[PDB]
Amino acid sequence: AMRQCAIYGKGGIGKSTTTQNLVAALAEMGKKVMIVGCDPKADSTRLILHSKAQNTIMEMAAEAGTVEDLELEDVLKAGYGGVKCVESGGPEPGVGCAGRGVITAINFLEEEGAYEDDLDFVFYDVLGDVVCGGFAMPIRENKAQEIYIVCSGEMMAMYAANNISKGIVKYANSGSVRLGGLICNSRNTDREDELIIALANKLGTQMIHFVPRDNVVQRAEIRRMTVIEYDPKAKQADEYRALARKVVDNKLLVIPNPITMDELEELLMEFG
Amino acid sequence: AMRQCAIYGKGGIGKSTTTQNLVAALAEMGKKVMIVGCDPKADSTRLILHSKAQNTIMEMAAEAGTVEDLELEDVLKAGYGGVKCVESGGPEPGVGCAGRGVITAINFLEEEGAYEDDLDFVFYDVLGDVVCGGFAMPIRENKAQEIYIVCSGEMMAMYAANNISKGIVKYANSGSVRLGGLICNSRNTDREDELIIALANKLGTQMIHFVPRDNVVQRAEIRRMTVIEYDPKAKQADEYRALARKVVDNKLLVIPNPITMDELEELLMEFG
Ligand SMILES: Nc1ncnc2c1ncn2[C@@H]1O[C@H](COP(=O)(O)OP(=O)(O)O)[C@@H](O)[C@H]1O
Ligand SMILES: Nc1ncnc2c1ncn2[C@@H]1O[C@H](COP(=O)(O)OP(=O)(O)O)[C@@H](O)[C@H]1O
Ligand SMILES: [Mg+2]
Ligand SMILES: [Mg+2]
Numbered sequence: 425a426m427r428q429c430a431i432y433g434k435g436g437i438g439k440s441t442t443t444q445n446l447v448a449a450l451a452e453m454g455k456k457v458m459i460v461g462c463d464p465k466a467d468s469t470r471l472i473l474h475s476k477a478q479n480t481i482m483e484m485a486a487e488a489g490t491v492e493d494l495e496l497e498d499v500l501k502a503g504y505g506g507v508k509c510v511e512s513g514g515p516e517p518g519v520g521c522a523g524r525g526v527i528t529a530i531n532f533l534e535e536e537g538a539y540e541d542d543l544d545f546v547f548y549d550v551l552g553d554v555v556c557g558g559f560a561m562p563i564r565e566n567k568a569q570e571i572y573i574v575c576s577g578e579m580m581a582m583y584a585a586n587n588i589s590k591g592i593v594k595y596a597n598s599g600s601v602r603l604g605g606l607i608c609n610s611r612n613t614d615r616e617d618e619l620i621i622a623l624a625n626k627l628g629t630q631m632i633h634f635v636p637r638d639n640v641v642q643r644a645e646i647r648r649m650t651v652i653e654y655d656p657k658a659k660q661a662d663e664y665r666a667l668a669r670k671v672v673d674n675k676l677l678v679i680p681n682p683i684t685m686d687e688l689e690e691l692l693m694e695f696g
Numbered sequence: 697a698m699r700q701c702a703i704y705g706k707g708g709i710g711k712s713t714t715t716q717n718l719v720a721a722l723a724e725m726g727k728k729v730m731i732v733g734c735d736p737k738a739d740s741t742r743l744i745l746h747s748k749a750q751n752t753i754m755e756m757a758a759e760a761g762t763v764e765d766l767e768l769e770d771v772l773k774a775g776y777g778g779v780k781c782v783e784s785g786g787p788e789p790g791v792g793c794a795g796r797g798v799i800t801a802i803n804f805l806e807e808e809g810a811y812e813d814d815l816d817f818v819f820y821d822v823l824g825d826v827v828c829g830g831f832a833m834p835i836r837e838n839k840a841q842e843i844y845i846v847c848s849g850e851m852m853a854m855y856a857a858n859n860i861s862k863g864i865v866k867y868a869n870s871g872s873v874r875l876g877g878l879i880c881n882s883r884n885t886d887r888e889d890e891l892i893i894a895l896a897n898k899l900g901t902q903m904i905h906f907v908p909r910d911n912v913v914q915r916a917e918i919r920r921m922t923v924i925e926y927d928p929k930a931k932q933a934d935e936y937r938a939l940a941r942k943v944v945d946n947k948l949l950v951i952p953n954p955i956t957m958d959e960l961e962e963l964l965m966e967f968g
Contacts, residue, residue, distance in 0.1 A: 434707050435825045436852030464826070465855065476957070517827035518835060518863035521793075553707045553825035554736070555789035563790060580708030583737065591790035646965075685748070693918075 426543045429604070429671070430462075430568030432552035434584035437574050438609035439463070441641060442667075443549045444471040448652035449661075449668035451505025455544040458500075460533065461511040462526045462559065468549040469509035473501055474648045480513025481532060482525040491528060496536040504653050510538075512558075523551070523558025530567055552584055555591040563591050566599030570677055572632065574607045575623075577616040577695070582623055582688055589627055589680040602677035605632035607667065612637045619695040626687060627680040633667040636660065698815045701876070701943070702734075702840030704824035706856035709846050710881035711735070713913060714939075715821045716743040720924035721933075721940035723777025727816040730772075732805065733783040734798045734831065740821040741781035745773055746920045752785025753804060754797040763800060768808040776925050782810075784830075795823070795830025802839055824856055827863040835863050838871030842949055844904065846879045847895075849888040849967070854895055854960055861899055861952040874949035877904035879939065884909045891967040898959060899952040905939040908932065 431443045440463070447457045448471075461468030467477045481499055485491040500508045512529035514522050533539065539546070548568050551559050562568035573588055575581040585606060592603055608620040608631055617634045624631045636659075644654035651660050703715045712735070719729045720743075733740030739749045753771055757763040772780045784801035786794050805811065811818070820840050823831050834840035845860055847853040857878060864875055880892040880903055889906045896903045908931075916926035923932050 435856070436706065436850060515828070516862060516866065517859045518832050518866040520828065522826035522828045551825070553823070554794035556787070556792065556794045556829075560790050578708060584707070587789045590788060594788065594790040 426539065426541070426546060427570060428546045428568055429570040429572060430548040430550050430562050431572050431574060432550050432588045433574035434581050435551065435553050437576060437581050438635070439549050439574050440468045441471075441645070442574050442607060442609060442635060443468065443547050445650045445652055445664040446668050446671065447507055447545070447547055448472065448504055448650040449665045450545060450672070451507050452652060452665070453668065456506065456542055457545045457547065458508040458510070458538065458543055460529065460546065460548045462529070462548050462550040462562065464514035464522050464525070464551065466511045466513055469501075469503070469511060470648055471645060471650045472503035472507045472509050474503060478509060478511040480511040480525065481529040482513035482515075485528070491532055494532070496533070496538055499532075500538065504650065521557045523556070523561070526550075526558030527561050530561065552588050555587060560591060563595050563601050566601060569600050570602060570604040570674075572604050572607055572671070574609050575620060576609050576611050577613055577619050578611065579688070579692060582691070585623065585627075586682050586688065590682045592680055593682060596679045603627065603629050603680040604671075604674055604677050605630050607632055608634045610635060610637045615695050619691060622691055622695070626683050626691075628678045629680060630676055632670050632674060633663070635663055635667065698811065698813070698818060699842060700818045700840055701842040701844060702820040702822050702834050703844050703846060704822050704860045705846035706853050707823065707825050709848060709853050710907070711821050711846050712740045713743075713917070714846050714879060714881060714907060715740065715819050717922045717924055717936040718940050718943065719779055719817070719819055720744065720776055720922040721937045722817060722944070723779050724924060724937070725940065728778065728814055729817045729819065730780040730782070730810065730815055732801065732818065732820045734801070734820050734822040734834065736786035736794050736797070736823065738783045738785055741773075741775070741783060742920055743917060743922045744775035744779045744781050746775060750781060750783040752783040752797065753801040754785035754787075757800070763804055766804070768805070768810055771804075772810065776922065793829045795828070795833070798822075798830030799833050802833065824860050827859060832863060835867050835873050838873060841872050842874060842876040844876050844879055844943070846881050847892060848881050848883050849885055849891050850883065851960070851964060854963070857895065857899075858954050858960065862954045864952055865954060868951045875899065875901050875952040876943075876946055876949050877902050879904055880906045882907060882909045887967050891963060894963055894967070898955050898963075900950045901952060902948055904942050904946060905935070907935055907939065
């Protein structure tokens with residue numbers, strides 16, 4: 425068995441930082457993990473690889489002729505803790521569909537046998553500002569069975585969480601894609617944890633962890649490292665270890681109950 | 697003549713707040729303006745209409761049978777200062793293409809003669825986290841001749857500005873779509889204005905205005921109002937009046953020069 429999880433959320437909310445640090449903590453624990461970047465920004469693996477970014481499947485397929493000329497051992501790269509990493513890539517802006525590379529990448533990984541029984545976790549890091557095209561494919565096509573949404577007290581971040589939840593509901597009759605929880609990535613504001621707990625309760629899920637805002641994140645990322653690797657003694661490292669333990673132990677996977685804009689506005693008014 | 701401008705930027709950066717306040721200031725000045733919402737969130741006109749949001753062309757077409765059963769005087773709604781307002785709408789999450797409603801809406805407005813010679817400005821408020829589908833159509837199909845990008849010192853916001861600029865370059869051989877400037881919507885951080893000026897200079901454009909972070913914005917929006925209408929004496933009202941004057945007077949419209957990720961990182965490092 426292997427657990428297939430996807431991290432969704434609005435742009436800039438902390439998906440890639442949270443995913444890479446969570447995965448580093450899982451590897452520290454002894455888990456075998458793959459990260460699949462599904463965001464055109466294509467920097468979802470740089471902290472595991474100590475790299476600028478990673479060359480994408482779309483780029484390598486073009487340089488090699490066809491995606492069939494690629495071998496899995498040519499694309500997948502291992503970094504901290506043995507974590508295996510791949511980036512989908514996507515068309516340049518104003519061309520085609522920004523999510524088209526995700527479809528190519530996930531089909532390539534499936535056909536080439538990247539999903540070896542020895543993997544314990546696969547994490548997809550997915551753009552969530554729109555839920556369409558290749559960015560909906562992990563939900564539509566049953567690839568990401570457990571979705572975790574990174575959000576914050578920001579109205580736009582909570583709106584995105586609600587929109588992603590509507591996409592999960594849309595495909596509830598096929599496959600087994602479910603909402604696993606919300607992850608609050610703090611803007612260090614008062615009662616922000618209580619706000620995201622309230623939102624989770626309204627959706628029918630839970631807030632799995634509250635990640636504090638900590639400058640050590642920037643100091644680690646300037647050096648192309650997770651906090652787990654950069655400063656294993658840091659308080660923030662222990663925060664990511666706590667998040668990873670709670671993901672491992674999580675048993676609540678639900679078809680969420682999206683809320684109205686009036687309910688969202690009332691939440692914000694109440695906690696402010 | 698009428699000037700056709702589009703406001704792009706990452707989600708949550710301040711596009712709709714900035715556009716509606718800028719447009720209220722233009723109306724206060726005596727200009728005739730239309731706002732076309734091109735973001736699936738569909739709340740781009742609520743502060744002009746004093747409303748929850750606005751019913752969308754996609755919704756009204758479905759309730760009426762076809763878009764041909766709609767009349768322009770049925771969709772367009774006027775609010776503060778006579779500003780005319782319309783929302784595109786879009787498919788539900790996980791269905792189709794999130795930008796498909798923009799294509800329907802802009803074609804409807806063109807065919808029904810919404811672009812009457814007496815309009816002075818049209819503003820499109822466009823989602824910019826991906827530049828594809830209907831969200832690229834204002835650029836691809838020559839609808840938004842002057843693009844203004846709302847951004848901030850946030851790395852993701854500057855990345856989005858660079859991505860939108862790449863889309864402009866892609867279509868530089870057809871039509872006349874050009875980058876008009878960057879608008880800094882402050883996270884009140886030190887030297888943030890200098891950072892966005894530097895980014896504008898590297899792209900070949902200018903930072904047209906620095907909009908401060910001001911709590912009066914929230915107090916106005918809780919009452920479904922622009923700051924221009926809510927408190928015309930506010931310092932922030934004068935900030936939006938300054939932005940509007942500089943848009944009116946702007947003569948620099950360029951094919952931008954997108955930068956590398958290394959250049960972007962160096963900017964952030966330098967000003968921090
Ligand atoms: N908990 C945190 N504390 C401090 N900085 C953070 C935290 N989480 C994310 N960041 C920073 O926020 C920025 C955006 O995070 P990122 O994971 O790249 O967002 P996304 O992948 O959702 O676009 C990065 O500069 C990152 O260092
Ligand atoms: N200059 C500002 N000062 C204070 N709050 C602001 C300012 N600009 C935007 N906001 C707030 O930020 C939030 C997002 O702005 P919005 O215009 O809806 O973003 P977008 O349309 O880009 O998604 C809103 O709650 C708005 O009130
Ligand atoms: Mg990311
Ligand atoms: Mg908006």
